[PDB]
Amino acid sequence: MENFQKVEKIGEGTYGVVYKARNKLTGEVVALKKIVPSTAIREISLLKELNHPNIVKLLDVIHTENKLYLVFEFLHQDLKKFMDASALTGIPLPLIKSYLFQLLQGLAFCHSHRVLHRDLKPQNLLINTEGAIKLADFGLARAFGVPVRTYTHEVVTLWYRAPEILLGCKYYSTAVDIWSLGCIFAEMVTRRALFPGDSEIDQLFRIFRTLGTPDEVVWPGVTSMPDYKPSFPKWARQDFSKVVPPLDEDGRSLLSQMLHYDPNKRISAKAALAHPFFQDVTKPVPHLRL
Numbered sequence: 001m002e003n004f005q006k007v008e009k010i011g012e013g014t015y016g017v018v019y020k021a022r023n024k025l026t027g028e029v030v031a032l033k034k035i036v037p038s039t040a041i042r043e044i045s046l047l048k049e050l051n052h053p054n055i056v057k058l059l060d061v062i063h064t065e066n067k068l069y070l071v072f073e074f075l076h077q078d079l080k081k082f083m084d085a086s087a088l089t090g091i092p093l094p095l096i097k098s099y100l101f102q103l104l105q106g107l108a109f110c111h112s113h114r115v116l117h118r119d120l121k122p123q124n125l126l127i128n129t130e131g132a133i134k135l136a137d138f139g140l141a142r143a144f145g146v147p148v149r150t151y152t153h154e155v156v157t158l159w160y161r162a163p164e165i166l167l168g169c170k171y172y173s174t175a176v177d178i179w180s181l182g183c184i185f186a187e188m189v190t191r192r193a194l195f196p197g198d199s200e201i202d203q204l205f206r207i208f209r210t211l212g213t214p215d216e217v218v219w220p221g222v223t224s225m226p227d228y229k230p231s232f233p234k235w236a237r238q239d240f241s242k243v244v245p246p247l248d249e250d251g252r253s254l255l256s257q258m259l260h261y262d263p264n265k266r267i268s269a270k271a272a273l274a275h276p277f278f279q280d281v282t283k284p285v286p287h288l289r290l
């Protein structure tokens, strides 16, 4: 790991600390994550073969001295910062659209190989100057664990967590990433998080107050999930037209099928790509200050 000069601490997070760095041989500019379990080594290593244009490439895995270093392709900005920069104005719809479409291609790819992200959030979505958006940190949650408290005391977000994970479903599927990207999609449109919980019960209860408390009608098997409680308050669903207002009906219709309560009814990434909302999809360039 001495083959890299550290330029700047990009950030810290669940697994470790990310630095911008330079290859002392190549001159290649990379993101170097400093995170070892053998199971975790083999799984990280098969992720190296998961290449796709909307997936941040894992250049190399440097395992030395009980220390693990993940060297990724570097991108100049994440979606959280692009969003904070665009607050006043909002992200134009055609770019939101391009972004959702490309993230769906990324998910269709990984899901077809049976790999889930499990932790999608605006900081894990990286963008460049040509209009591309890529998923970062795919596969890592299953390969190492997803802690309560991110490494540097920071608390991983729950705002994007699917309801079956919150209800203690042990074997959740690729549908959990479609739930999370739906919540991001909504947030790009409105400029405000859809479900900002600050705890697991608050998270749940914020989902219940917009989409209605789920029951055996909308979701067969829900009432015998491990953290389901018959004492949960019964709240009615609200309409999407109030939820993500500006969005047109193709957009709300796609969003509502991404937010289905039952993960077997939730749209897959491959069906979502054929949805009529994407009929006029283009690829615009964003306005970016590096």
Ligand SMILES: Nc1ncnc2c1ncn2[C@@H]1O[C@H](COP(=O)(O)OP(=O)(O)OP(=O)(O)O)[C@@H](O)[C@H]1O
Residues within 6 Å of the ligand: 010, 011, 012, 013, 014, 015, 016, 017, 018, 031, 056, 072, 073, 074, 075, 076, 077, 078, 119, 123, 124, 125, 126, 136, 137, 150, 156
């Ligand atoms: N490949 C990369 N290129 C450029 N910047 C990156 C890259 N990967 C990560 N960063 C940015 O570095 C910061 C730290 O990323 P990090 O993975 O540690 O945290 P996170 O995405 O916020 O949470 P999590 O640990 O769950 O991934 C975030 O701002 C991330 O967007």
Ligand SMILES: [Mg+2]
Residues within 6 Å of the ligand: 013, 123, 124, 136, 137
């Ligand atoms: Mg990350």
